[PDB]
């Protein structure tokens, strides 16, 4: 499964997920890519800050959904 993230330099990487992956798993994969730590990451989709603790298919994230990172510190 892939989703979009939009990167810090509004460049877009793709990330390979599994539907059951939760917020704390996609920040781990970003800090793979990205280096960015995860307590420095916060992600939004459609506007919402997801949040550690809840899976993709709990926010309806599906193929090709798009996520924002944003930088806190």
Do not use: C, W
């Not at 920040?27 to 420095?40: F, L, N, Y």
């Amino acid at each position: 499964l892939q989703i979009f993230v939009k990167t810090l330099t509004g460049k877009t990487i793709t990330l390979e997920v599994e539907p059951s992956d939760t917020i704390e798993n996609v920040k781990a994969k970003i800090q793979d890519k990205e280096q960015i730590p995860p307590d420095q990451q916060r992600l939004i989709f459609a506007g919402k800050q997801l949040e550690d603790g809840r899976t993709l298919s709990d926010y309806n994230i599906q193929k090709e959904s798009t996520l924002h990172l944003v930088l806190r510190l």
